[PDB]
């Protein structure tokens, strides 16, 4: 590559590895966004939640993508697993398995920060820093945040609960 | 002082120690406001609610401050001490003890009316009664209120109630 | 906490020890601000300048409140120390006094920093970076023009020098 | 009087009596500012300064024979005493006998507002609190401010510092 410099093989490699852990979480996301909308189901607000997540995750990889482009770094594509469910249950099961899924890719972020580091490749550090890092923790606060509101509201009248924090706390 | 006229040096010190009756208030409603921003926690309004007192007893102290100084009186600052508690509980534990605050600050308050009253200090009396007597009158029912809906809210499906007077009565 | 990821205790229990700084911080501004406005001191440009400065303190300990949020920490407050003087003497004086405040601040903040590196932590190293250091950096550097100022107009004519910089210098 | 209700002949006496202060007051001023527009003295700040302070008192008197006739007491003028000095040396010495006059009348406003409270009269003392005990308070502060400012200036170049505190503090 005429333009590769200070770019270990190492970090391209996993950053092709990220790319497909991106695509598979946009994945996810149309499923969860797509089920949410299914009319045995009809939460419009958490079908709008999902949805925009799988958007959101697209931007991710897009933008590793274009890094990749500009380190000189060269993308490899695999095959992107289905996501982990095709029912999502309710509410709470379903906003549990995002947090899961964020709480991977949080990891997969800081491991090639990591990574990075060890490389000496500040440029790397300091775009995960700016495009992901912190977007990942305001993220994981919401998801936090809602887990914390449909378990006030679930238990007993649980079916009504659903209904008010998809009426009352998203937007459709 | 060149401008001293009619201020008693009881007055000054009694201001002087409301002066950090409203800056301990304050601290309170910054450990309440950010008790209810945590993702335990999760009630975005009700954090918002009390975030909006600490800002105004801020005024309230700057007010006194400013006042002391146009007076020719002397500032002389204590330690803030920390909160009372680093748990608030549910809104109504965290209401309640905001009510209790509040009317310690407005006995506070009276107290100093009955003192500048009592040195003939008409001008300390007419700055209570414009900047803080009526400010703490309408608070106080303001928190009645709320304690009164909460409670219509309260009892067996009391998480439920939390949710729906934070999203229905608390401005986010 | 169902939020927490990569942060150490000990990160969460400095980060409520930086907040009791800024809060101490903030409270010594407040009194350097009154001091200035007093009518036997009576520098109108000087006390805006410390007035400023005790909201940008306020701004750090709630953007690092927010920030504990945000990362599952827990805050914890403890007593405010009273500021260390309670006269501030003349405009060089009070300068020099702030600006220690700002090397200590400064430094609090480095080994922060230091510690977050140390736990590799970057989320927490990528908020200081950007929400602080070059703060801190721009507010020392200004410190040190004004003391430069202050001190060419110093010795013999030095009531003259303090209203000049106050008048040309400070804004209103 | 068909309209006069809880208002004392001493009151009613009182007001008069205030009325000829404030219009003394006025007459003062009138002449402090017409004396720094000599050619010989030569500052139009201090001389605008004075000026705005005779119209000032020239509100204060009015609003009184207003209350007066609102009252239904009856005003009664005596002779207007000439200004106690006919040259009023340099802008400190003006300053201090300024700031003599208010506090002369801020002793008169507050005796009256003992009489009109020992008259058990609220709506007098609530006609004082609200249109000139805090006026004079905030108007003493601020010649306090300037003496300040002035004796900063004084001594050895006192004509230098003359100039600039009419040139950087007063608005011409
Ligand atoms: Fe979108
Ligand atoms: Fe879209
Ligand atoms: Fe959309
Ligand atoms: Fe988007
Ligand atoms: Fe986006
Ligand atoms: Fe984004
Ligand atoms: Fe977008
Ligand atoms: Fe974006
Ligand atoms: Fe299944
Ligand atoms: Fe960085
Ligand atoms: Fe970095
Ligand atoms: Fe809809
Ligand atoms: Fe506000
Ligand atoms: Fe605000
Ligand atoms: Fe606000
Ligand atoms: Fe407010
Ligand atoms: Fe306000
Ligand atoms: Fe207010
Ligand atoms: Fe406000
Ligand atoms: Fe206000
Ligand atoms: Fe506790
Ligand atoms: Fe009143
Ligand atoms: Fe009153
Ligand atoms: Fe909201
Ligand atoms: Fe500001
Ligand atoms: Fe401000
Ligand atoms: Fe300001
Ligand atoms: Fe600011
Ligand atoms: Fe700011
Ligand atoms: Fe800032
Ligand atoms: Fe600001
Ligand atoms: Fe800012
Ligand atoms: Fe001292
Ligand atoms: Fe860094
Ligand atoms: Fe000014
Ligand atoms: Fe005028
Ligand atoms: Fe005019
Ligand atoms: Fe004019
Ligand atoms: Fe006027
Ligand atoms: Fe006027
Ligand atoms: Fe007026
Ligand atoms: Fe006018
Ligand atoms: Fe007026
Ligand atoms: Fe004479
Ligand atoms: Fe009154
Ligand atoms: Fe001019
Ligand atoms: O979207
Ligand atoms: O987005
Ligand atoms: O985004
Ligand atoms: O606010
Ligand atoms: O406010
Ligand atoms: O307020
Ligand atoms: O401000
Ligand atoms: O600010
Ligand atoms: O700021
Ligand atoms: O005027
Ligand atoms: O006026
Ligand atoms: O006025």
Redesign the interface.
């Known amino acids: 590559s005429q333009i590769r410099q200070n770019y270990s093989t190492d970090v391209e490699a996993a950053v092709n590895s990220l790319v497909n852990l991106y695509l598979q979480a946009s994945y996810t996301y149309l499923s969860l966004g797509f089920y949410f909308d299914r009319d045995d189901v009809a939460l419009e607000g958490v079908s709008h939640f999902f949805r925009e997540l799988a958007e959101e995750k697209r931007e991710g990889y897009e933008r590793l993508l274009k890094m990749q482009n500009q380190r000189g770094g060269r993308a490899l594509f695999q095959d992107i697993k289905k996501p982990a469910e095709d029912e999502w249950g309710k509410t709470p099961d379903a906003m549990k398995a995002a ?1 899961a899924l964020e ?1 991977k890719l ?2 997969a972020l ?1 491991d090639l ?2 990574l990075g ?1 060890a490389r000496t490749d500040p440029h790397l ?1 300091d775009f ?3 495009h992901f ?2 977007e990942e ?2 993220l ?2 919401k ?7 449909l378990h ?6 649980a079916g ?2 659903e209904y ?2 998809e009426r ?2 998203l937007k459709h």
Chains 1, 2, 3, 4 share one sequence.
Do not use: W, Y
């Open positions: 947090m709480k949080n990891q800081l920060h990591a580091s550090c995960l820093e700016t890092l912190d923790v305001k994981i606060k998801m936090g945040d809602h887990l914390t509101n006030r509201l679930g238990g007993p009248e009504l609960g008010l924090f009352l706390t």
